[PDB]
Design a protein around this nucleic acid. Structure first.
Ligand code: MG
Ligand code: MG
Ligand code: MG
Ligand code: MG
Ligand code: MG
Ligand code: MG
Ligand code: MG
Ligand code: MG
Ligand code: MG
Ligand code: ZN
Ligand code: ZN
Lengths: 129, 206, 217, 97, 82, 87, 100, 129
RNA sequence: GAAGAUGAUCAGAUACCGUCGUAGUCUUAACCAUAAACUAUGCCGACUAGGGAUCGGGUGGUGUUUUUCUUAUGACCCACUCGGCACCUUACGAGAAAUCAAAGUCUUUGGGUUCUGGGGGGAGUAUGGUCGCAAGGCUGAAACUUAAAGGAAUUGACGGAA
């Protein structure tokens, strides 16, 4: 089966980056995926991206900037209790300074810093450094 | 940006056609090459000419951009184009390599033929491949005359051309030389077939 | 007794390349060794170990000596040099030379907050050689060089003041470990940050600019 | 490759079970569990044991180094088992009697 | 195909080449061939991959024999496209 | 990078490839600076003025490098008809 | 011990376990893949003897036929004399028919 | 086994490079010249060298060789290259008619230039290889 | 042709070689449930680099030939298409390396799952279970012992290998 569509997409993106492609084609194209992409854009890791309407599920194209290094996805969507966020960041991200840990929460799909600012955490999706 | 002057002269195009710079490549074809202009049936590919010309021009420009002239190391192993290479070298002072390349030429600072280029030029990256590899060890640009089955690994500015050979490679070389001359030199005009000849180049009767 | 081959060498001799920074920027090869010395007078050369090493022969064996040398300062440069020769001193010298040739810069970044001068690594960087993965995680201040002895020494040479490691696989293949560490260090400059998103001009190289002074007459 | 172990968010019990199962390959752990020290191991899983010197016995050493190693056949008091104890330093065996 | 493909708009040739599935949007290349039999003057909107012994509207004429893919149009029969 | 109040720390601020963005390392022996001389009307290649491109080594190794260069040129305005957007 | 080859017995790939063939010389059961199948197309008469036959014979041109023996060899047996010919590691990859 | 040694050969080559003129075919003279020139300690060795030189000269007299192309030889070559037996006419003009180009070629020309001399071939793809 | 007869050879040789040749081999009715059952590569999923072929489907070719005149099937040629039993380079991806286009996208560690392993031996044993007509199978210890056991390759030395 096609489990974690988002994860697959992320993997594809990573592969593309490794190759030195300037853009990616993604099949399934979810809400979560879209959110992630938006977040990335906000941060400054991704160019344009466009949702094709296959009169069906979806189909995204992402413009890679050459800035992404890894665009990871942590596997089961672990339940993060605000203090554990720091730990997670330490585990995943290079440096206290930079990078993000994209985690869904009540407020919306946001990065770790954003969540902290809000004062609202939840379940992790991925990361970007 | 561009002058919008050099749009491939008709005469030049004709010459190229005669050479059969663009009837080469054959059945065999590389995924990194969109210089084709329609496949002629049964064991043939036709090469886009304008694109080739543009590439040549670019190469010439690059060459010009190197300030010290005795520097543009031209190379040729395979026999058809060695003469052409030599001619080119003679025309524009840049120490060439006809015949054997010598491994450890661009690396290996003891060798008698220790060149140190800032711009390598090649005919067949299928054969001279070694030269290209050597260049890749020490940060040099590589210009090369790609047939559409030739590998373009560690190659830049790959002038597309027929490497069945005989007339074509030589002709291409001549064209390149002309371009170089035009971009800073004696020749100030794109027109006039001028005192040189293509047939100075070409493979000779042994 | 100087005399250079290599355009770059000639340039250096002339005195138009100021520091190794320029060289690094234009990734220029340094096949000659003296250039590095000229650039950097503060090269501390430390021999890490010397394995005796034996080819087996119809009669007896060919004892040679794989001398490992680490070279540095405290600026953010390191060299790792391995050579195996029969005369020990000679071998050591060769190793040193190799290290000098290599000498490679290190991006030293901030633990957390800028405040003072930087003496940890910027990002979590790692290397690999055989079955040794040296992972260098950036430390806080004063926390020291938390590493295998050789690794620690290397760090010191570099001018990294505080750092965490996680050397995994067979670390006792000492040379291999050292190599891995070196690789990791190299990877520091290479790992893109948001600090370097901003576009640079692409400067002309000294080799292009001072082309008349370089090359023989 | 998902790599063997279940990475689900509710796959915890299974994981635990697996870990437990694995634990029985680790030797020290096994020993701790089964009480091999308490059931065997001449001593009672203890640091020391007092024992009676039944006789002085010179034992011939393994290999490379060749010698007689002045051991003693000891009978442990608490259990009643019979073991062989090496006696250190020069002489020493005389002292032991 | 390398580095900068620019993936929203391919040349149509490529699309044609690739599987009826493996383009941007799913779109079939089967057609409703509007067949006329030699007998009665009436048009049957025959799908080109019939899967059936395609009779006329009533008369037992037999229009198309369903080959695995596209149907062979039985005997000298005439057709319009779509 | 920027200590306290500017004071740019960390020298050797690297050449980033034109095609990939990918940082060109200190010992990236394969990576190359192409210099393309600036054109003028009727011959003339303007001495001492270039469009300079950096190519990373990975791309070169791949053989996706020439194409990338061509694309770059097209973007700039050093070519016409060569690199198409769609293939 | 590593794999000497990728193929090994060669033809058996996506072929479970095939039928076997008996060797000519040894009569060792060898799979019909790890087999070494040289084709002996000898003339029915010996080279020098052909002339003699001609001298003897009736008719013109003549049949002068060829005997046909597709010989199967148990690898080891083949190695002792036959087409096998122990190669270098790099030379093993070459599957082109030799000579010619 | 009268294989003239490597050192001797090298010496001979050097001599040739230096003094192609003042090396007249015949042997005694050559020997004398060698003696005058280079500091050969031995006599036999000198003789051998002379012989080698003579041989080289003879070879040259029947055309050039590899590793022996010093100055005079280059000049000889060079002149020929400069003033080739060819070319009468252009050459590679439109000597016979106006270029037997293919259909594809013609099309390409049309796309590119405006008005060129053409002779449009049929383009027989042809059976078999 | 295991068993067994028997003829040589060697210090000997119920061993090859040799000759013979019950059981089987083959089959039919029951079992058994093991294999270097080996691709010594679990399955499902996704993505990353070129190339030709090759089988099975299916498109297009005023292509060629069949020839019963247009044919229409058939059979190729060529291009693409999806499909399983299959080469070259660089690897930036890997890997201890042989090598690997997967054994890659892993200290820049998390797509989804099952199963298995934790120095060597003792030991696939002891024991109990269980499964069998049995032979055996599945299941499965410890005491005790020991500093190596392995793997891959490198140079040698050697080989009744070439
Ligand atoms: Mg001893
Ligand atoms: Mg073996
Ligand atoms: Mg084994
Ligand atoms: Mg199958
Ligand atoms: Mg099988
Ligand atoms: Mg028998
Ligand atoms: Mg007997
Ligand atoms: Mg064990
Ligand atoms: Mg082994
Ligand atoms: Zn009807
Ligand atoms: Zn046999």
């Amino acid at each position: 089966t096609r489990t974690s569509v988002l994860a697959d997409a992320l993997n594809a993106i990573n592969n593309a980056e490794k190759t030195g492609k300037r853009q990616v084609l993604i099949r399934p194209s979810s809400k979560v995926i879209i959110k992630f992409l938006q977040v990335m854009q906000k941060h400054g890791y991704i160019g344009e991206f466009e949702y094709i309407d296959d009169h069906r599920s979806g189909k995204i194209v992402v413009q890679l900037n050459g800035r992404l290094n890894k665009c990871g996805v942590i596997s089961p969507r672990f339940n993060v209790k605000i203090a554990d966020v720091e730990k997670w960041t330490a585990n995943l991200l290079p440096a206290r300074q930079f990078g993000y840990v994209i985690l869904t929460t009540s407020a919306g799909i946001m990065d770790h810093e954003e969540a902290h600012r809000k004062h609202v955490s939840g379940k992790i999706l991925g990361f970007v450094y | 940006s561009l002058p919008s002057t050099f749009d491939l002269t008709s005469e030049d195009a004709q010459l190229l056609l005669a050479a059969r710079v663009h009837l080469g490549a054959k059945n065999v074809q590389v995924h990194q090459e969109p210089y084709v202009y329609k496949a002629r049936p049964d064991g043939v590919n036709v090469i886009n000419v304008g694109k080739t010309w543009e590439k040549i021009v670019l190469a010439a420009r690059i060459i010009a951009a190197i300030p010290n002239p005795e520097d543009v190391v031209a190379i040729s192993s395979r026999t058809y184009g060695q003469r052409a290479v030599l001619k080119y070298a003679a025309h524009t002072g840049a120490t060439p390599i006809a015949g054997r390349f010598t491994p450890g030429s661009f690396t290996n600072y003891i060798t008698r033929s220790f060149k140190e280029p800032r711009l390598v030029i090649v005919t067949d990256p299928r054969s001279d491949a070694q030269a290209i590899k050597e260049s890749s060890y020490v940060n040099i640009p590589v210009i090369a005359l790609t047939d559409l089955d030739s590998p373009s690994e560690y190659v830049d500015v790959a002038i597309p051309c027929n490497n069945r050979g005989k007339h074509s490679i030589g002709l291409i070389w001549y064209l390149l030389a002309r371009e170089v001359l035009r971009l800073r030199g004696a020749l100030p005009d794109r027109t006039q077939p001028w005192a040189i000849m293509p047939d100075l180049y070409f493979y000779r009767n042994p | 007794g100087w005399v250079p081959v290599t355009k770059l060498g000639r340039l250096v001799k002339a005195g138009k390349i100021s520091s190794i920074e320029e060289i690094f920027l234009h990734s220029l090869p340094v096949k000659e060794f003296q250039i590095i010395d000229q650039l950097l007078p503060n090269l501390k050369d430390e021999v890490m170990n010397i394995k005796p090493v034996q080819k087996q022969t119809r009669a007896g064996q060919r004892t040679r000596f794989k001398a490992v040398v680490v070279v540095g300062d405290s600026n953010g440069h390191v060299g790792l040099g391995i050579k195996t020769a029969k005369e020990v001193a000679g071998a050591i010298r060769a190793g040193i030379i190799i290290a000098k040739l290599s000498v490679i810069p290190i991006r030293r970044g901030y633990w957390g907050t800028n405040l003072g001068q930087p003496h940890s690594l910027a990002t979590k960087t790692s290397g690999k050689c055989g079955s040794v993965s040296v992972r260098l995680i950036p430390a806080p201040r004063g926390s020291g060089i938390v590493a295998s002895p050789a690794v620690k020494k290397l760090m010191q040479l570099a001018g990294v003041e505080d750092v965490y490691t996680s050397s995994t696989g067979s670390t006792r293949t000492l040379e291999n470990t050292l190599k891995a560490a070196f690789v990791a260090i190299g990877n520091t400059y290479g790992f893109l940050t948001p600090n370097l998103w901003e576009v640079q001009a692409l400067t002309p190289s000294p080799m292009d600019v001072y082309a008349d002074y370089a090359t023989a007459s | 490759m998902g790599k063997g172990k279940p990475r689900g968010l509710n796959s915890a019990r299974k994981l635990r079970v697996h870990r437990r199962n694995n634990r029985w390959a680790e030797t020290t752990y096994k020993k701790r569990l089964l009480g091999t020290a308490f059931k065997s191991s001449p001593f009672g899983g203890s640091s020391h044991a007092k024992g009676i010197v039944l006789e002085k016995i010179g034992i011939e050493s393994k290999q490379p180094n060749s010698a007689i190693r002045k051991c003693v056949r000891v009978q442990l008091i608490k259990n009643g088992k019979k073991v062989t104890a090496f006696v250190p330093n020069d002489g020493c065996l005389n002292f032991v009697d | 195909m390398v580095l900068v493909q620019d993936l929203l708009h391919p040349t149509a040739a490529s699309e044609a080449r690739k599987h009826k599935l493996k383009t941007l949007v799913q779109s079939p290349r089967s057609h409703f061939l509007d067949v006329k039999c030699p007998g009665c003057l009436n048009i049957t909107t025959v799908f080109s991959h019939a899967q059936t012994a395609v009779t006329c509207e009533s008369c037992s004429t037999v229009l198309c024999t369903p080959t695995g893919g596209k149907a062979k149009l039985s005997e000298g029969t005439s057709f319009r496209r779509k | 990078m920027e200590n306290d109040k500017g004071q740019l720390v960390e020298l050797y601020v690297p050449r980033k490839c034109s095609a990939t963005n990918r940082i060109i390392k200190a010992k990236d022996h394969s990576s190359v600076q192409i210099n393309i001389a600036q054109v003028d009307e009727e011959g003339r290649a303007i001495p001492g003025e270039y469009v300079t491109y950096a190519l990373s080594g990975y791309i070169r190794a791949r053989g996706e490098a020439d194409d990338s260069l061509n694309r770059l040129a097209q973007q700039d305005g050093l070519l016409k008809n060569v690199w198409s957007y769609s293939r | 011990m590593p794999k000497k080859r990728a193929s090994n017995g060669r033809n058996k790939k996506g072929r479970g376990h095939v039928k076997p063939v008996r060797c000519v010389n040894c009569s060792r059961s060898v799979p019909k893949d790890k087999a070494i199948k040289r084709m002996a197309i000898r003339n029915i008469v010996e080279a020098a003897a052909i002339r003699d036959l001609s001298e003897a014979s009736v008719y013109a041109e003549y049949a002068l036929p060829k005997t046909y023996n597709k010989l199967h060899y148990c690898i080891s047996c083949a190695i002792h004399a036959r087409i096998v010919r122990v190669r270098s590691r790099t030379d093993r990859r070459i599957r082109a028919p030799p000579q010619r | 086994g009268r294989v003239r040694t490597k050192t001797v050969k090298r010496a001979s080559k050097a001599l040739i490079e230096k003094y192609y003129p003042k090396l007249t075919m015949d042997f005694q003279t050559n020997k004398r010249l060698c003696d005058e020139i280079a500091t050969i300690q031995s006599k036999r060795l000198r003789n051998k060298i002379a012989g080698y030189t003579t041989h080289l000269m003879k070879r040259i007299q029947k055309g050039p060789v590899r590793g022996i192309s010093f100055k005079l030889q280059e000049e000889e070559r060079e002149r020929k290259d400069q003033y080739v037996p060819d070319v009468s006419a252009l050459d590679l003009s439109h000597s016979n008619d106006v270029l037997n180009v293919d259909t594809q070629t013609a099309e390409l020309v049309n796309s590119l230039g405006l008005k060129l001399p053409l002779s449009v071939s049929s383009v027989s793809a042809v059976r078999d290889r």
